[PDB]
Coordinates of N, CA, C and O in Angstrom, one line a residue:
Chain A
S1 N 11.6 126.5 -1.9 CA 10.1 127.1 -2.2 C 9.4 127.5 -0.9 O 9.2 126.5 0.0
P2 N 9.1 128.8 -0.7 CA 8.3 129.1 0.6 C 7.0 128.7 0.7 O 6.4 128.4 1.7
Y3 N 6.4 128.2 -0.5 CA 5.1 127.6 -0.5 C 4.9 126.3 -1.3 O 5.5 126.2 -2.3
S4 N 4.1 125.5 -0.7 CA 3.9 124.1 -1.4 C 2.5 124.3 -2.1 O 1.7 125.2 -1.7
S5 N 2.2 123.6 -3.2 CA 1.1 123.6 -3.9 C 0.0 123.2 -3.0 O 0.1 122.3 -2.2
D6 N -1.2 123.9 -3.2 CA -2.3 123.6 -2.4 C -3.7 123.4 -3.2 O -4.8 123.6 -2.7
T7 N -3.6 123.4 -4.5 CA -4.8 123.2 -5.4 C -5.2 121.7 -5.1 O -4.5 121.0 -4.5
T8 N -6.4 121.4 -5.5 CA -7.0 120.2 -5.3 C -7.4 119.5 -6.6 O -8.2 120.2 -7.3
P9 N -6.9 118.4 -7.0 CA -7.2 117.8 -8.2 C -8.6 117.2 -8.2 O -9.0 116.4 -7.4
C10 N -9.5 117.6 -9.2 CA -10.9 117.1 -9.3 C -11.1 116.5 -10.7 O -10.3 116.8 -11.6
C11 N -12.3 115.9 -10.8 CA -12.6 115.2 -12.1 C -14.0 115.7 -12.6 O -15.0 115.6 -11.9
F12 N -14.1 116.0 -13.8 CA -15.3 116.4 -14.5 C -15.6 115.5 -15.7 O -16.6 115.7 -16.4
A13 N -14.7 114.6 -15.9 CA -14.8 113.6 -17.0 C -14.1 112.4 -16.7 O -13.0 112.4 -16.1
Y14 N -14.6 111.2 -17.2 CA -13.9 109.9 -17.1 C -13.3 109.4 -18.3 O -14.1 109.4 -19.3
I15 N -12.1 108.9 -18.4 CA -11.6 108.4 -19.5 C -12.5 107.1 -19.9 O -12.7 106.2 -19.1
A16 N -12.9 107.1 -21.1 CA -13.7 106.0 -21.7 C -13.1 104.6 -21.9 O -13.6 103.6 -21.3
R17 N -12.0 104.6 -22.6 CA -11.3 103.4 -22.7 C -10.3 103.1 -21.6 O -9.5 103.9 -21.2
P18 N -10.2 101.7 -21.3 CA -9.2 101.4 -20.1 C -7.8 101.8 -20.5 O -7.4 101.8 -21.6
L19 N -7.1 102.2 -19.4 CA -5.8 102.9 -19.5 C -4.7 101.7 -19.8 O -4.8 100.6 -19.0
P20 N -3.7 101.9 -20.6 CA -2.7 100.9 -20.7 C -2.1 100.5 -19.4 O -1.4 101.4 -18.8
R21 N -2.5 99.4 -18.8 CA -2.1 99.0 -17.4 C -0.7 99.2 -17.0 O -0.4 100.0 -15.9
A22 N 0.3 98.9 -17.8 CA 1.7 99.1 -17.4 C 2.1 100.6 -17.2 O 2.7 101.0 -16.2
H23 N 1.5 101.5 -18.0 CA 1.7 102.9 -17.9 C 1.1 103.6 -16.7 O 0.8 104.8 -16.8
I24 N 1.0 102.9 -15.6 CA 0.5 103.5 -14.3 C 1.4 103.3 -13.2 O 2.1 102.2 -13.1
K25 N 1.7 104.4 -12.5 CA 2.5 104.4 -11.3 C 1.8 104.4 -10.0 O 2.3 103.6 -9.0
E26 N 0.7 104.9 -9.8 CA -0.1 105.0 -8.6 C -1.6 105.4 -8.9 O -2.0 105.6 -10.0
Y27 N -2.3 105.5 -7.9 CA -3.7 105.8 -8.0 C -4.1 106.5 -6.7 O -3.5 106.3 -5.7
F28 N -5.1 107.3 -6.7 CA -5.7 107.9 -5.5 C -7.1 108.4 -5.7 O -7.6 108.7 -6.8
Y29 N -7.8 108.4 -4.6 CA -9.2 108.7 -4.7 C -9.4 110.3 -4.5 O -8.8 111.0 -3.6
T30 N -10.0 111.0 -5.6 CA -10.2 112.4 -5.4 C -10.7 112.8 -4.2 O -11.5 112.0 -3.5
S31 N -10.5 114.1 -3.8 CA -11.0 114.6 -2.5 C -12.6 114.7 -2.4 O -13.3 114.9 -3.4
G32 N -13.0 114.4 -1.2 CA -14.5 114.4 -0.9 C -15.0 115.8 -1.2 O -16.3 116.0 -1.2
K33 N -14.0 116.9 -1.3 CA -14.5 118.1 -1.5 C -14.9 118.4 -3.0 O -15.7 119.2 -3.3
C34 N -14.2 117.6 -3.8 CA -14.6 117.5 -5.3 C -16.0 117.2 -5.5 O -16.6 116.6 -4.6
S35 N -16.6 117.7 -6.6 CA -18.0 117.4 -6.8 C -18.3 116.0 -7.3 O -19.4 115.3 -7.0
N36 N -17.3 115.3 -7.9 CA -17.4 113.9 -8.3 C -16.4 112.9 -7.6 O -15.2 113.1 -7.7
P37 N -16.9 111.9 -7.1 CA -16.1 110.8 -6.4 C -15.5 109.9 -7.5 O -15.9 108.8 -7.8
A38 N -14.3 110.5 -8.0 CA -13.5 109.8 -9.0 C -12.3 109.0 -8.5 O -11.9 109.1 -7.4
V39 N -11.8 108.3 -9.5 CA -10.5 107.5 -9.3 C -9.5 108.2 -10.2 O -9.8 108.6 -11.2
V40 N -8.2 108.2 -9.7 CA -7.2 108.9 -10.6 C -6.0 108.0 -10.7 O -5.4 107.6 -9.7
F41 N -5.7 107.7 -11.9 CA -4.5 106.8 -12.2 C -3.4 107.8 -12.7 O -3.6 108.6 -13.6
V42 N -2.2 107.7 -12.1 CA -1.1 108.5 -12.5 C -0.2 107.7 -13.5 O 0.4 106.6 -13.2
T43 N -0.3 108.2 -14.8 CA 0.6 107.7 -15.8 C 2.2 107.8 -15.7 O 2.5 108.6 -14.8
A44 N 2.9 107.2 -16.4 CA 4.4 107.3 -16.4 C 4.7 108.7 -16.8 O 5.8 109.2 -16.4
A45 N 3.9 109.4 -17.6 CA 4.2 110.8 -18.0 C 3.6 111.6 -17.0 O 3.5 112.9 -17.0
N46 N 3.3 111.1 -15.8 CA 2.8 111.8 -14.6 C 1.5 112.5 -14.9 O 1.1 113.4 -14.2
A47 N 0.8 112.1 -16.0 CA -0.5 112.7 -16.2 C -1.4 112.1 -15.3 O -1.2 110.9 -14.9
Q48 N -2.4 112.8 -14.9 CA -3.4 112.3 -14.0 C -4.8 112.1 -14.7 O -5.5 113.0 -14.9
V49 N -5.0 110.8 -15.0 CA -6.2 110.4 -15.7 C -7.3 110.0 -14.7 O -7.2 109.1 -13.9
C50 N -8.5 110.6 -14.9 CA -9.7 110.5 -14.2 C -10.5 109.1 -14.6 O -10.6 109.0 -15.9
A51 N -10.9 108.4 -13.7 CA -11.6 107.2 -14.0 C -12.9 107.0 -13.0 O -12.9 107.4 -11.9
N52 N -13.8 106.3 -13.7 CA -15.1 106.0 -12.9 C -14.9 104.8 -12.0 O -14.6 103.7 -12.6
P53 N -15.2 104.9 -10.7 CA -15.0 103.8 -9.8 C -16.1 102.7 -10.0 O -15.8 101.7 -9.4
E54 N -17.0 102.9 -10.8 CA -18.1 101.9 -11.0 C -17.6 100.9 -12.2 O -18.1 99.7 -12.3
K55 N -16.6 101.4 -12.9 CA -16.0 100.6 -14.0 C -15.4 99.3 -13.7 O -14.6 99.3 -12.7
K56 N -15.5 98.3 -14.4 CA -15.0 97.0 -14.2 C -13.5 97.1 -14.2 O -12.8 96.5 -13.2
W57 N -12.8 97.6 -15.2 CA -11.4 97.6 -15.2 C -10.8 98.5 -14.1 O -9.7 98.1 -13.6
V58 N -11.3 99.6 -13.8 CA -10.8 100.4 -12.6 C -10.8 99.6 -11.4 O -9.8 99.5 -10.7
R59 N -11.9 99.0 -11.2 CA -12.0 98.0 -10.0 C -10.9 97.0 -9.9 O -10.2 96.8 -9.0
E60 N -10.6 96.5 -11.1 CA -9.5 95.4 -11.2 C -8.1 96.1 -11.0 O -7.3 95.7 -10.4
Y61 N -8.0 97.3 -11.8 CA -6.8 98.1 -11.7 C -6.5 98.5 -10.3 O -5.3 98.5 -9.9
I62 N -7.5 98.9 -9.5 CA -7.1 99.4 -8.1 C -6.7 98.2 -7.2 O -5.6 98.5 -6.6
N63 N -7.2 97.1 -7.4 CA -6.8 95.9 -6.6 C -5.3 95.4 -7.0 O -4.5 94.9 -6.2
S64 N -5.1 95.4 -8.4 CA -3.8 95.0 -8.9 C -2.7 95.9 -8.3 O -1.6 95.4 -7.8
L65 N -2.8 97.2 -8.3 CA -1.8 98.2 -8.0 C -1.4 98.0 -6.5 O -0.2 98.2 -6.1
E66 N -2.4 97.6 -5.6 CA -2.1 97.5 -4.2 C -1.7 96.1 -3.9 O -1.6 95.6 -2.7
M67 N -1.3 95.3 -4.9 CA -0.8 94.0 -4.6 C 0.6 93.7 -5.4 O 0.6 93.5 -6.6
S68 N 1.7 93.8 -4.7 CA 3.0 93.7 -5.3 C 3.0 93.0 -6.7 O 3.5 93.7 -7.6
Chain B
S4 N -9.8 118.1 -20.8 CA -9.9 116.7 -21.3 C -10.5 115.7 -20.3 O -11.4 116.2 -19.5
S5 N -10.0 114.6 -20.2 CA -10.5 113.6 -19.2 C -9.4 113.7 -18.1 O -9.5 112.8 -17.3
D6 N -8.5 114.6 -18.0 CA -7.6 114.7 -17.0 C -8.0 115.6 -15.8 O -9.0 116.3 -16.0
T7 N -7.5 115.4 -14.7 CA -7.9 116.1 -13.5 C -7.9 117.5 -13.7 O -7.1 118.1 -14.5
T8 N -8.8 118.4 -13.0 CA -8.8 119.7 -13.1 C -8.5 120.4 -11.7 O -9.1 120.0 -10.8
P9 N -7.4 121.3 -11.7 CA -7.1 121.8 -10.4 C -8.1 122.8 -9.8 O -8.5 123.7 -10.6
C10 N -8.6 122.5 -8.7 CA -9.7 123.4 -8.1 C -9.1 123.8 -6.7 O -8.2 123.1 -6.1
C11 N -9.7 124.9 -6.1 CA -9.2 125.4 -4.8 C -10.4 125.4 -3.8 O -11.6 125.5 -4.1
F12 N -10.0 125.0 -2.5 CA -10.9 124.9 -1.4 C -10.5 125.7 -0.2 O -11.1 125.6 0.8
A13 N -9.5 126.6 -0.5 CA -8.9 127.5 0.5 C -8.2 128.6 -0.3 O -7.7 128.3 -1.4
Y14 N -8.0 129.7 0.3 CA -7.2 130.8 -0.2 C -6.1 131.2 0.6 O -6.3 131.2 1.9
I15 N -4.9 131.4 0.1 CA -3.8 131.8 0.9 C -4.2 133.0 1.8 O -5.0 133.8 1.3
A16 N -3.7 133.1 3.0 CA -4.2 134.2 3.9 C -3.4 135.6 3.7 O -3.8 136.6 4.2
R17 N -2.3 135.6 3.1 CA -1.5 136.8 2.8 C -0.8 136.8 1.4 O -0.7 135.8 0.9
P18 N -0.5 138.0 0.9 CA 0.2 138.1 -0.3 C 1.4 137.1 -0.5 O 2.2 137.0 0.5
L19 N 1.5 136.6 -1.6 CA 2.7 135.7 -1.8 C 3.9 136.6 -2.2 O 3.7 137.7 -2.7
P20 N 5.1 136.2 -1.9 CA 6.3 137.1 -2.2 C 6.2 137.2 -3.6 O 6.4 136.3 -4.4
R21 N 6.1 138.5 -4.2 CA 6.0 138.9 -5.6 C 7.0 138.3 -6.5 O 6.6 137.8 -7.5
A22 N 8.2 138.5 -6.2 CA 9.3 138.0 -7.1 C 9.3 136.6 -7.4 O 9.9 136.2 -8.4
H23 N 8.6 135.7 -6.6 CA 8.5 134.3 -6.9 C 7.4 133.9 -7.8 O 7.4 132.8 -8.4
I24 N 6.5 134.8 -8.1 CA 5.3 134.7 -8.9 C 5.8 134.7 -10.4 O 6.4 135.7 -10.9
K25 N 5.5 133.6 -11.2 CA 5.8 133.5 -12.6 C 4.6 133.7 -13.5 O 4.7 134.5 -14.5
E26 N 3.5 133.0 -13.3 CA 2.3 133.1 -14.1 C 1.2 133.0 -13.1 O 1.3 132.7 -12.0
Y27 N -0.1 133.0 -13.6 CA -1.2 132.9 -13.0 C -2.3 132.3 -13.8 O -2.2 132.2 -15.1
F28 N -3.5 131.8 -13.2 CA -4.6 131.4 -14.1 C -5.8 131.2 -13.1 O -5.8 131.0 -12.0
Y29 N -7.0 131.4 -13.8 CA -8.2 131.2 -13.1 C -8.7 129.8 -13.2 O -8.7 129.3 -14.3
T30 N -9.0 129.2 -12.0 CA -9.4 127.8 -12.1 C -10.7 127.7 -12.9 O -11.6 128.5 -13.0
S31 N -10.8 126.5 -13.5 CA -12.0 126.1 -14.3 C -13.3 126.5 -13.6 O -13.5 126.5 -12.4
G32 N -14.3 126.9 -14.5 CA -15.6 127.3 -14.0 C -16.3 126.1 -13.4 O -17.3 126.3 -12.5
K33 N -15.9 124.9 -13.8 CA -16.5 123.7 -13.5 C -16.3 123.6 -11.9 O -17.0 122.9 -11.2
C34 N -15.2 124.2 -11.3 CA -14.8 124.1 -10.0 C -16.0 124.8 -9.2 O -16.7 125.6 -9.8
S35 N -16.3 124.4 -7.9 CA -17.2 125.0 -7.1 C -16.8 126.3 -6.6 O -17.7 127.2 -6.4
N36 N -15.5 126.6 -6.5 CA -15.0 127.8 -6.0 C -14.3 128.6 -7.0 O -13.5 128.0 -7.9
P37 N -14.5 129.8 -7.1 CA -13.9 130.6 -8.1 C -12.5 131.0 -7.4 O -12.4 131.1 -6.3
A38 N -11.4 130.9 -8.2 CA -10.1 131.2 -7.6 C -9.0 131.5 -8.7 O -9.1 131.2 -9.9
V39 N -8.0 132.1 -8.2 CA -6.8 132.4 -9.1 C -5.7 131.6 -8.4 O -5.5 131.5 -7.2
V40 N -5.0 130.9 -9.4 CA -3.9 130.0 -8.9 C -2.5 130.7 -9.3 O -2.3 130.8 -10.4
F41 N -1.8 131.2 -8.4 CA -0.6 131.8 -8.7 C 0.5 130.7 -8.9 O 0.5 129.7 -8.1
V42 N 1.3 130.8 -9.9 CA 2.2 129.8 -10.2 C 3.7 130.3 -10.2 O 3.9 131.5 -10.7
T43 N 4.5 129.1 -9.5 CA 5.7 129.9 -9.2 C 6.7 129.1 -10.1 O 7.8 129.5 -10.4
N46 N 6.5 126.6 -10.4 CA 6.5 125.3 -10.0 C 5.2 125.1 -9.2 O 4.6 124.0 -9.1
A47 N 5.2 126.1 -8.1 CA 4.2 125.6 -7.1 C 3.0 126.3 -7.4 O 3.0 127.4 -7.9
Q48 N 1.9 125.7 -7.1 CA 0.6 126.3 -7.5 C -0.3 126.7 -6.2 O -0.8 125.9 -5.5
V49 N -0.2 128.0 -5.9 CA -1.0 128.5 -4.8 C -2.3 129.2 -5.0 O -2.5 130.0 -5.8
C50 N -3.4 128.7 -4.3 CA -4.7 129.3 -4.4 C -4.9 130.6 -3.8 O -4.3 130.8 -2.7
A51 N -5.6 131.6 -4.3 CA -5.8 132.8 -3.9 C -7.2 133.3 -4.2 O -7.8 132.9 -5.1
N52 N -7.7 134.4 -3.4 CA -9.1 134.9 -3.6 C -9.0 135.9 -4.7 O -8.3 136.9 -4.7
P53 N -9.9 135.7 -5.8 CA -10.1 136.6 -6.9 C -10.5 137.9 -6.5 O -10.4 138.9 -7.3
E54 N -10.9 138.1 -5.3 CA -11.5 139.3 -4.8 C -10.5 140.3 -4.2 O -10.7 141.5 -4.2
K55 N -9.5 139.9 -3.7 CA -8.5 140.6 -3.0 C -7.7 141.6 -4.0 O -7.5 141.3 -5.1
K56 N -7.4 142.8 -3.3 CA -6.7 143.7 -4.2 C -5.2 143.3 -4.6 O -4.9 143.5 -5.8
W57 N -4.5 142.8 -3.7 CA -3.2 142.2 -4.2 C -3.2 141.2 -5.2 O -2.4 141.1 -6.0
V58 N -4.3 140.4 -5.2 CA -4.5 139.4 -6.2 C -4.7 140.0 -7.6 O -4.0 139.7 -8.6
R59 N -5.7 140.9 -7.6 CA -6.0 141.7 -8.9 C -4.7 142.4 -9.3 O -4.4 142.5 -10.5
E60 N -4.1 143.1 -8.4 CA -3.0 144.0 -8.7 C -1.8 143.2 -9.2 O -1.0 143.6 -10.1
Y61 N -1.6 142.0 -8.6 CA -0.5 141.1 -9.1 C -0.7 140.7 -10.5 O 0.2 140.7 -11.3
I62 N -2.0 140.3 -10.7 CA -2.3 139.9 -12.1 C -2.1 141.0 -13.1 O -1.6 140.7 -14.2
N63 N -2.4 142.3 -12.6 CA -2.2 143.4 -13.7 C -0.7 143.6 -13.9 O -0.3 143.7 -15.0
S64 N 0.0 143.6 -12.8 CA 1.5 143.7 -13.0 C 2.1 142.6 -13.8 O 2.9 142.8 -14.7
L65 N 1.6 141.4 -13.7 CA 2.1 140.2 -14.6 C 1.8 140.4 -16.0 O 2.6 140.2 -16.8
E66 N 0.5 140.8 -16.2 CA 0.1 141.1 -17.7 C 1.0 142.1 -18.3 O 1.4 142.0 -19.5
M67 N 1.3 143.2 -17.6 CA 2.1 144.3 -18.1 C 3.5 144.0 -18.1 O 4.2 144.4 -19.2

């Protein structure tokens, strides 16, 4: 492919109910260019689910993922 | 939905090789920048104002 994707994933809504923990592969902080400072959890179906960084579960989820 | 929305913060500087273009779409209005994303697999941001962008889109529809 002569070109790689260059779109930027942003968030305009946060998932209300905590995400099934196991069904998560990675996470990443949306770009500072986006309008909302969100958290993104990548599901096993490679879906990119937006989450609120102030949420208790997200906070726990972020720390778990970065610890073997 | 509650899924990420692809937005653009830059536009490619030259026309994409036409034969590689499969489909296209206008990024959500929620995005701060208006843009057309050409799809090949790969998603390339482009300026909705350029002639080749508008013309590529016309060719695609037809």
